[PDB]
Amino acid sequence: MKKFTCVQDIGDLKSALAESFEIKKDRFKYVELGRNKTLLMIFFNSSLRTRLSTQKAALNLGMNVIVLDINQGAWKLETERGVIMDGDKPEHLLEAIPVMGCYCDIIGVRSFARFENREYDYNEVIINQFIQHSGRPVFSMEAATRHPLQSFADLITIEEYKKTARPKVVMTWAPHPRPLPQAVPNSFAEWMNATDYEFVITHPEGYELDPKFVGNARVEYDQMKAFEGADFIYAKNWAAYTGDNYGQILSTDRNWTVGDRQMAVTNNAYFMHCLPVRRNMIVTDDVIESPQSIVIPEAANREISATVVLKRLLENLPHHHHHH
Amino acid sequence: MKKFTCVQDIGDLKSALAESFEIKKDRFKYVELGRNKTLLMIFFNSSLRTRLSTQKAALNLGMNVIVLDINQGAWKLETERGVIMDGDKPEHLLEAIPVMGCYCDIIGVRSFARFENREYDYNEVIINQFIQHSGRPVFSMEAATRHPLQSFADLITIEEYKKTARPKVVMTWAPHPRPLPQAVPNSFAEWMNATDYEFVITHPEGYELDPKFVGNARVEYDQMKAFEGADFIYAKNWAAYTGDNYGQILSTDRNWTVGDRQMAVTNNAYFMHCLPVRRNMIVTDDVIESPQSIVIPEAANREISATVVLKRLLENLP
Amino acid sequence: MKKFTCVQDIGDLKSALAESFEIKKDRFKYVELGRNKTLLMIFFNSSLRTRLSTQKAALNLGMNVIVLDINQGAWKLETERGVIMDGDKPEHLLEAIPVMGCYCDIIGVRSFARFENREYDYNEVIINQFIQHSGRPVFSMEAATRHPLQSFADLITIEEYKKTARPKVVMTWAPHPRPLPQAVPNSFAEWMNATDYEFVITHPEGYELDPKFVGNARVEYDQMKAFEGADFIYAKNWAAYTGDNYGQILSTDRNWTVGDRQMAVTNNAYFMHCLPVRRNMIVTDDVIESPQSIVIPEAANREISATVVLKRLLENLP
């Protein structure tokens, strides 16, 4: 593992999963692995959830942790050459990022989609600057178009609760009052496509995701049809992506809200959601509070996916270093 | 001990005190007790004193520490069923709090009195939500109506300095420009009631505290009379609690400001204050700088009460 | 070493430098030194560079670390006696600082020059309050008029890259859009004056630094003349200091911007800057991107100077 931004980085899912469950049962088995190794967690958009679970994971590995919160207004990086820097930006990319790599061994970066330009957002500018110039292994704490730590945790929980080898897993859109990134849905599809599960995506018209993420997944427009015989339901809202609707809410249709009506059609499926969840918009009180709701164990698994990811990066650190 | 929000949680005062003094002399004696145990400190009201002393205490026990700062607006939790949550609350209580409890072993919560509705403040909603839903032991880093880490430090201080078995301890109100919560005075009263000390409360008319907290204290409205023969003076301002004056300032009378006039009548009493303290409003420069002022050793003991509390909680984990 | 605010505090330079290169090659050699020791970092000005490098250093020594961020103006300690404290000042110096020292073993303080009153700034009020009242060794994470951690890192960097025993080191002013403090320039001169290097200061007329820092150093107003034969070029902008211009920008002359024109007359000199750096204002892309630019290794050395300082402060605790 040279970085952790997408499913490809984790390699064979089997050993990754083996490691996950070994750690779930013996949390500090690798507490000596990160001794005197330092993690730098950088948030360009405040978090409380990813902040806590990532920190706990690092501690499972005996690592030192340094957290930095940087507001958009404090991240003015000049990127071009020949610029007379007498304006806003007090620093150039070429000195600012490498210097941060000076004081740590691994960097976690949490970026975000600003929803003003699709190209820019999908270019994943912030995380790629750290990959390219920090001089350290970088893992994503959620980027503009993926959230691998979330997806990995989601995969761990399906493996944890599934009744068969190849469950039918359905990812469904649901309404939200705000325009949301397609980072979680993109990522979930990417990871599900990497498994042997029967994977289906249902969403209203106009909410199609990028083909590179959708891949060969069956896209069903009839939510009830898609839900039939499902073993797991993964609900998530996202703003539009294609055409000229990028970044916008095209619907707030609560008929998509996951309730007993759609769940009744499944094979008594488990209910999943990455959190935070707005009840009766994404899912009903009855469904999220039922015994098939595993949103809490799913959240607990965020500590595990982080712990395995950090373990892998720790195992991939170079043994020797440069000294002038 | 399953939580730490009031004096009752600490049980027998004698053994809690023996442990306090054992740790004062050998600070890192239990540094292994907390290895691979994670303390999550959550501040809903910013702080720096409790923040610093609590972290230092957890390190005394070798614990990992994670601090979260949540300001208002970042804590809108839905609590009702059947709500179409497309408003300002981004999540429900039944998801948010259990999730937080997933990544830690012990949780410290610092909540606060809002002052716009007494019933709500005294219901201690935020801290009770964490106790009921986190799945972890919870301790108060100051709540809306109690501050047991402070009172426990105050108790250790009085035992450390007392010149008699059952000293006369006097808690007195003093003027302040802002409306302050009843947390420290309620909590101090609650802890003094658990001792065998002679305890007196003195404050202007209208500033009475919840009988739930005043307990068996003798209330004396004449401050000079209350001070008579005192061995310890614990000064603290609080906004009104009773009637329709909840959360309001009824007085700013500096006759209550603790100076030599009142101290002269005590048995050369020690002077105590939880801090921060406004000089010449709460207490005079000469009093707070006199040999019997023990405000600093008292603040030092915040580290001790917190490590004894964290140690008791650690000893009670599954 | 009981404190670290200036070059005298480091003691013998050779020995401090020896420890620096030792730690550079064996970063965790003294990780047991700071076991159960707590460092309190206090920022009165938010930072990312100093915050990050100082925390890493403490970890190199196995220390516990607590970082406090205190908003400018949220820190108003009353210093006078007989003051009726019903204003904006929440507490008195005499209580506040000693209390913070109760919960830690070493304190790092990052203060700043407000540029409102020269004399107040040069009195280094904040760092001195901590030194005089906290009861703990204190080190500057950057003050109003010095930045010893930065200067020490710079010294390490020159020692690390020097091609000769006594290189010619030149500190040159360069233009900036805003009024910057003289802390870095004052400190670099202070440290260079302590070495046996050929040290030259070059700036526009009016940018003279306090003679307390310039001391016996050579000041050359002709930038090119100052540059010829140099082995190291240390660039930094600062606002005027002398007389009526304290804190003011007297020039933004891009003729001082360090580019190939000036570097050409040096003996292929290395280029240094403490960061952050405005390109084409302080130095051109070509110079800062050439192999003679050691701005990053210089920044890396901030970790090393802070580790040596913390190590020496630790070695001298009771």
Curated annotation (Swiss-Prot), chains B, C:
Site positions per UniProt: Key residue in conferring substrate specificity for N-succinyl-L-ornithine versus N-acetyl-L-ornithine: 90
Residue ranges crossing the lipid bilayer per the database entry: none
Statement: the UniProt record of this protein carries the keyword Nuclease: no
Keywords: Amino-acid biosynthesis, Arginine biosynthesis, Transferase
The enzyme's E.C. designation: 2.1.3.11
Positions contributing to N(2)-succinyl-L-ornithine binding: 142, 176, 236, 278
GO biological process: arginine biosynthetic process via ornithine; citrulline biosynthetic process; L-arginine biosynthetic process
Catalytic activity: N(2)-succinyl-L-ornithine + carbamoyl phosphate = N(2)-succinyl-L-citrulline + phosphate + H(+)
SUPFAM superfamilies with a match to the protein in the record: Aspartate/ornithine carbamoyltransferase
Source taxon at top rank: Bacteria
Pathway where it operates: Amino-acid biosynthesis; L-arginine biosynthesis
Role noted for this protein: Catalyzes the transfer of the carbamoyl group from carbamoyl phosphate to the delta-amino group of N(2)-succinyl-L-ornithine to produce N(2)-succinyl-L-citrulline. Is essential for arginine biosynthesis. Has no activity with either L-ornithine or L-aspartate as substrate. Also has no detectable AOTCase activity, being unable to convert N(2)-acetyl-L-ornithine to N(2)-acetyl-L-citrulline.
Listed name of the protein: N-succinylornithine carbamoyltransferase
Species this protein is from: Bacteroides thetaiotaomicron (strain ATCC 29148 / DSM 2079 / JCM 5827 / CCUG 10774 / NCTC 10582 / VPI-5482 / E50)
Encoding gene per record: argF'
